[PDB]
Design a protein around this motif. Sequence first.
Motif, mmCIF file in Angstrom:
data_model
loop_
_atom_site.group_PDB
_atom_site.id
_atom_site.type_symbol
_atom_site.label_atom_id
_atom_site.label_comp_id
_atom_site.label_asym_id
_atom_site.label_seq_id
_atom_site.Cartn_x
_atom_site.Cartn_y
_atom_site.Cartn_z
ATOM 1 N N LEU A 187 85.021 -9.944 -15.069
ATOM 2 C CA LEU A 187 85.496 -8.668 -14.551
ATOM 3 C C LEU A 187 84.473 -8.131 -13.560
ATOM 4 C CD1 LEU A 187 88.000 -8.592 -16.240
ATOM 5 C CD2 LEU A 187 87.320 -6.346 -17.110
ATOM 6 N N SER A 188 84.922 -7.874 -12.330
ATOM 7 C CA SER A 188 83.999 -7.555 -11.247
ATOM 8 C C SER A 188 83.359 -6.180 -11.395
ATOM 9 C CB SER A 188 84.727 -7.635 -9.904
ATOM 10 O OG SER A 188 85.818 -6.731 -9.861
ATOM 11 N N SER A 189 83.949 -5.284 -12.185
ATOM 12 C CA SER A 189 83.467 -3.913 -12.276
ATOM 13 C C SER A 189 83.402 -3.475 -13.730
ATOM 14 C CB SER A 189 84.373 -2.961 -11.486
ATOM 15 O OG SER A 189 83.993 -1.612 -11.690
ATOM 16 N N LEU B 14 86.474 -1.479 -14.595
ATOM 17 C CA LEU B 14 87.630 -2.228 -15.077
ATOM 18 C C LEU B 14 87.474 -2.596 -16.547
ATOM 19 C CD1 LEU B 14 88.396 -4.513 -12.005
ATOM 20 C CD2 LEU B 14 89.462 -2.349 -12.655
ATOM 21 N N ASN C 198 90.916 -7.789 -10.206
ATOM 22 C CA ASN C 198 89.702 -8.599 -10.223
ATOM 23 C C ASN C 198 89.819 -9.807 -9.302
ATOM 24 O OD1 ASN C 198 87.581 -7.659 -12.370
ATOM 25 N ND2 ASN C 198 89.579 -7.324 -13.335
ATOM 26 N N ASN D 239 86.859 -10.204 -7.134
ATOM 27 C CA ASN D 239 85.984 -11.356 -7.337
ATOM 28 C C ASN D 239 85.862 -12.172 -6.055
ATOM 29 O OD1 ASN D 239 85.190 -10.935 -9.993
ATOM 30 N ND2 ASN D 239 86.882 -12.129 -10.862
#
Lengths: 49, 459, 459, 600, 267
Positions: free
Chosen positions: E230-232, E235, E263, E267
């Motif tokens: 998960l990029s954040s 999230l 994502n 990503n």
Amino acid sequence: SLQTSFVTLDEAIKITNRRVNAIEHVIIPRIERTLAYIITELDEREREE
Amino acid sequence: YLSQPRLTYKTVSGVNGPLVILDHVKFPRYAEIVHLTLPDGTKRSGQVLEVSGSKAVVQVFEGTSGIDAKKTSCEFTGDILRTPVSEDMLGRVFNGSGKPIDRGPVVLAEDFLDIMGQPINPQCRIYPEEMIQTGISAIDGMNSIARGQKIPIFSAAGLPHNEIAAQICRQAGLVKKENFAIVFAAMGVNMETARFFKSDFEENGSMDNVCLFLNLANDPTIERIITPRLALTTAEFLAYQCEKHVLVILTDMSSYAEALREVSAAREEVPGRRGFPGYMYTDLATIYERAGRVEGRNGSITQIPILTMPNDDITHPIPDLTGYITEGQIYVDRQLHNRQIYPPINVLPSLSRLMKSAIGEGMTRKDHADVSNQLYACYAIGKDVQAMKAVVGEEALTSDDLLYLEFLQKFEKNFITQGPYENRTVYETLDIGWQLLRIFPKEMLKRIPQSTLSEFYPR
Amino acid sequence: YLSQPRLTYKTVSGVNGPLVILDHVKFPRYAEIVHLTLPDGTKRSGQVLEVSGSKAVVQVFEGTSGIDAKKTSCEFTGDILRTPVSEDMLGRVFNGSGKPIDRGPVVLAEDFLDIMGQPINPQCRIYPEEMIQTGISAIDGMNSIARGQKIPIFSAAGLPHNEIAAQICRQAGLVKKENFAIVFAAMGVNMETARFFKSDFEENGSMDNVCLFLNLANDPTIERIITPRLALTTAEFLAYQCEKHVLVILTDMSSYAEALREVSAAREEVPGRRGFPGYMYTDLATIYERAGRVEGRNGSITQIPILTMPNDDITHPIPDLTGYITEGQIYVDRQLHNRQIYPPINVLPSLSRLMKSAIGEGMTRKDHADVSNQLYACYAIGKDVQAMKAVVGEEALTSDDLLYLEFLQKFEKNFITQGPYENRTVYETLDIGWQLLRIFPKEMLKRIPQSTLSEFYPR
Amino acid sequence: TFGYVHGVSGPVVTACDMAGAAMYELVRVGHSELVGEIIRLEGDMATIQVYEETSGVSVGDPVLRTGKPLSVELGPGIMGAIFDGIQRPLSDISSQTQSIYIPRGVNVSALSRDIKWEFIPSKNLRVGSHITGGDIYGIVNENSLIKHKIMLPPRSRGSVTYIAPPGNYDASDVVLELEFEGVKEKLSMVQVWPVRQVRPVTEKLPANHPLLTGQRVLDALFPCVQGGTTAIPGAFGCGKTVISQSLSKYSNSDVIIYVGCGERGNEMSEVLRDFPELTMEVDGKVESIMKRTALVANTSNMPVAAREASIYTGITLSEYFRDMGYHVSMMADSTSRWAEALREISGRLAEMPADSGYPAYLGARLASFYERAGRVKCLGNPEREGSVSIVGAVSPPGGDFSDPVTSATLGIVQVFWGLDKKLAQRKHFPSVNWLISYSKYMRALDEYYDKHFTEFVPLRTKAKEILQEEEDLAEIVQLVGKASLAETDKITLEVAKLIKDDFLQQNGYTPYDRFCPFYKTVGMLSNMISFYDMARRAVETTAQSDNKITWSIIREHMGEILYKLSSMKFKDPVKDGEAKIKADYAQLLEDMQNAFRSLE
Amino acid sequence: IKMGGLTSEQYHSQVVGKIGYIARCMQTIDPENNLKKIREDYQDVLIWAEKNYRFEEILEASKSGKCPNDLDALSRRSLILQELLRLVSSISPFKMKLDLIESQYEKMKQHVNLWKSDYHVKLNQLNQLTDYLKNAAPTPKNNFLRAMTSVLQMQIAQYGITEDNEGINQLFKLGLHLLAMANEKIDEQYHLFKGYVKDQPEESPFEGILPAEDQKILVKTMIDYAMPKLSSKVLQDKLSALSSSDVLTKTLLDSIDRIVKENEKLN
């Protein structure tokens, strides 16, 4: 053409007749004699048993 | 230990061939050992074959000639045949009964081991996966031997099975990616054969590691009943107790089977095939099945019996029942010997049932199994093509049939043929196999996966 | 009637294999049936195999396992094995010894007949004459069976001889241009095939005619010996007393020969030819020759023994002596079987000696003999033409050769190939034969007199 | 109570003072108590076939007279157990003795009495409920795979006066106890059953479900069924190499019982080493094959009486697990060595032999063994259907087809996978000779095929026809020549080569051909027969026409199609799923149809 | 004379054994005697159980023919009850209604060969799944299988088994596919589970089929699978917020897919 076919057929017939004669005068008698000998020897084994 | 005095009977009730039937025996013990003092003082030994109440059918090893009732004294030892075994039995020569014939002293027993052997639990018998590089390409290449295997040499009269056995003995060794101790049991070998083997062992410097049991043709024929067991017992002592990699050679199981048949006919037992005892399978198994490795031990007993097939008949009861027990067979051919090939090993009827797990990557090489399979296939097809040619003539053979005949010729000339003192490493044998397979195009090598053809064929 | 009480003996002197040797017997009767109680109450039957002085060697139907001296009792029934025979055992399934295995009641006897029977008087036997139609074209139209013939089926292991036997049992009957019955005896027939027979006859609705005797492979072998005698005693009762045309199908006479060998070895007789009893010819004659029409009685007994030719060897003692005793042969071919033709009955080597007595006007039809002869001739010529075509090529063949090939194909596809549940009346078989003969023009049917061609060829 | 030894001759002892001894009863001969079985009675003397080496047994030795015949202990602990020919546990002997030798007269229990077993009674049972032989009155969690159903012994019956609660119990603990006619019989989890007595069943049902071996030739041309009775040659390259382990790793069977009647030493070692290391995918987990396999190891040098009883012990264990409701696949490593044991014992007994020295009752013994196979509605109230599928290995002298053991086998077994020595020499594996090998279960399997593989039966018929046509044509091709062949004959020969080399030839050592699912088999055969039919259609239709088509034209046009048909055998079910393989074969069929449409 | 291959003593023991087992089966599937038609149809064998007898008494009655002593007919009649009891037990927490039970019984009795019936095969598959899950340990395969088999038992109780409901067939096929799939094919297990919850007509299949704790554990399992990559952190917090859902739902999976696509872009 007829004479060429004639010569070729003559040679092929001679070869095939030689093959048949060789079979029925050498190979088949050999196998028949082998079978007779095998039968006699199996009879001997049965006699010994 | 047995402290009670032994009982000596002058009560011999009958003599019949090798058998001496006694009566009035106090509690006969089956398989007991008896010592027969003949009237003139000659001392012989025998084994109680059966007991029935007060009777005992002793079987004399040295023969019953000269034995008389009313005067032969049979002293019952009170125990089964327990042979003495010691490590110094290596480098010794004994007769079929284990007595020295090299002018050394009697064996000073390290232990007393039953000749019948102690059965080994199958749960703890290791599967032999170590190849023996005998140096014979006809065996290494296609009928490889694994250390611990039983694999006889089927041959006939006049073939060089003794020479092949000597070559294996002097060349046997593991594959290079512990030297063998040889135990020899000669049964019915003429003086020439025993002298040949003894001279071969002395010349090759291995005599310090060789223990010979010699039962020549002139020797008693009931003695060779115990000659192999004795040998194997020693092998076991050297292998499972002294941790030695033993190689047991049994010269003529045909002569041992003839001794078995002699005793059986004397006993008037119900006969098997060809007069051999109905229990020849079990008696032969009790000898063959003593090979192999065991868990916890480091030694092994490779067993290489040698058979003289009567009338070259691989269906004869002796070779037949030896095939049923031993793991394969090396087959010496009369036709190849007549054509002056050596070794005359015919690879079509011979096989080694532990070759599959002994060859391959890590053990010998990736291509071993495929090369052997393709060589066997090509050899069989070439033999069939030769049989066809003998009938129809070469002018009727196709190009592929001529290729098969050429492969057969070069295979018997380069692969099977081999000098008696030339040991070809497994890799050289495989290289020769590839050089012979290259005769055919890749499209005709059907039994070799392409992954190996692309790697070994193009070279 | 036997009014005297039965004697029960605990005087068991020995047990050996299947034999219980009792002693102190009061006037032992040879072949007596004797019921013995084991120590635990298990009841078994046995037959007095041999008698001597006061002894009696009882071959127990079941094994001797569990039998012991000092506790096993043995009641001598005082009479030989007599079977209860009636018409109500038509539509019943019995085991080898006659005990019903269809969950029906025991046979309420109309008579008690000795199974061994007596030889039919030669001066009272009559030539079989009319035909028994089996519904199978390959033998109705080419090997028809006369009322009173003995015509075995020859097959090897794995061929559908049992399926053909079931088909004949389901379809057999009189030509019909309730006096027919079938007595099916199965010997040494594994459980799967016995269940097949039983369920097939029950399901197909022909059981009202069939009396079925099943001797499974694992049922006693002495039961196998007495099974055909039970079957033929029932057949004799139904034919020569109830006056109905019986067909006896005795399956796997090779298994019966094996049981005969076992009993002979139990008697301690030396093996005869090829390991079988020397008197096997007399025993097979005793079984087969309980057949044929008789003088003054409207019933008959046709026989169709079925043989598993071991090793596909027509010289084997069982098929050899069967051919010596019987009057024909129906060959089940492995080649036709592999080609997936059913029934795989080869009509060239097969033969029915008394076909001529089973065909003609008033029995089957006017043209039966001519159609059969022409079909056989054209079939042989078709096989010959196939062999020729294989050498010369299709083009080189003449028009007549193409006609013969077409007839061969359509004959093996329409005449021979039938299907298990395709019942063809002999008239249907002859109609198919004429459909196949109309491939050729009238002139090539040289074996059919013009008087017949002018009548049956058209259409 | 106990007799005395009167004489000894090899394994045949003769014991006196045995007045009341029963035939085939067990006795203990000698001071070491060697197992023996009474095989003959003469007055008050009994002849005893001893199951151990008789060396050292002296006249006057005691002979204990046990009242039971040769029987096996059936209960928890069979699975994963390696047994001698007479139920002796080799592993337990090794652990208890701490030595590599089998002590003479060793008397270790066949089933360990120290292992605690998780026993759960059938909840619906209660005190006073009526039960009979074969009733599953409890289940023992023997391992993750086999739930050992504790069945009341056959010939037992009565009212449950006590059923143990769920828990952990020894193999010796009294777990159930039932009263009948006032007599109370207490039953633990292990039941003793004679090896030579057939275990009763409610009804032997017909066999109607295939037993899938891994081989296409065996599965398609010569099917076997659950409860079948098969005979297989013991030739090298085939048999123990693939078929046995292939049946082990995956098949319709739920248990494997493998009896080494006369196994060679190192080959038995190979079996005992390989089997505990094979694994199988069950419910998404790899589990050892030993969890549902048992081995009855009997080497060739073991006593001949043990070699004779090994088959019976194996089939009795197989019957026991059949009664549970399982499908037990049994493999008899050699019925030929069993027949040799029978011959030797007959000779020792001085009986008159049949042909070639075998006892005249060899056929009877083989029938008594084989016919114990089959699918059965097992005894006991909880309805279940088990089966025992016997595969007996034969090995005649020099491949003799008239060998008395083989001849006796062929009259009993319903399947026979004969051996082609020519194929074996050519290294064509499996070496089944499809011309004399047969299977009588095709008719019974018609119902299964016409419902699951509807199209397979005509494919098998056409394949058999094609193979027979090739057999008929090869004789002529080699006797005379290949020039006179018609186009249809060429199609037959080349399609037969295709089928033989790439459908009937299966290398069992490869990841892709170790086991061939029947969907793979039927799809491959469908493609080959479709090609056969369509090529024959082409050549026949274009015959008597200007644009004639010949086999050479077809081969030259679509060498790619032939190559793809050849490579069809390489599909790997493990990674090429069933859907993928079926789609690929459908694509091959589409390509064949397109290429023939272009040709036409 | 042997009957069915058994000695007559063994046959007459088996008869009483079958009678007792039929009585036990009836006491198990209907201790309250609600199934009156079934009781009437089997009354001739349950007479010997309702009234108390001894084993030898019933054996003697069978030997004299008083009892129903056709072991084949008794075997068929007992197999019908055994199959019905198997159906009742395999769905033991999700018991069904009387009329449905009687209809299933009637279809059984009408069947020509109940052992080979497709009904028997379906019951075998259900028992296979249940036996797998009786001692199963927590893992996404086992959790998904447990939920899917609970809903399968619900559908079986609702529609029985004689009716080849398409939903029940789909549940059988998917459950067996998940069972046979290797434990290491985690992505495929999640794929099949989410495909099932997608293709179920009900938007929230497991609302009442499963206990609340297992529903929350399933939601947690899906959230945990979505957690990796998960990029954040935002999230991940949104995933935690979605974790507040009481049970899995189609819209919940769609939200997971929405976050997954977010994502994918990120990503």
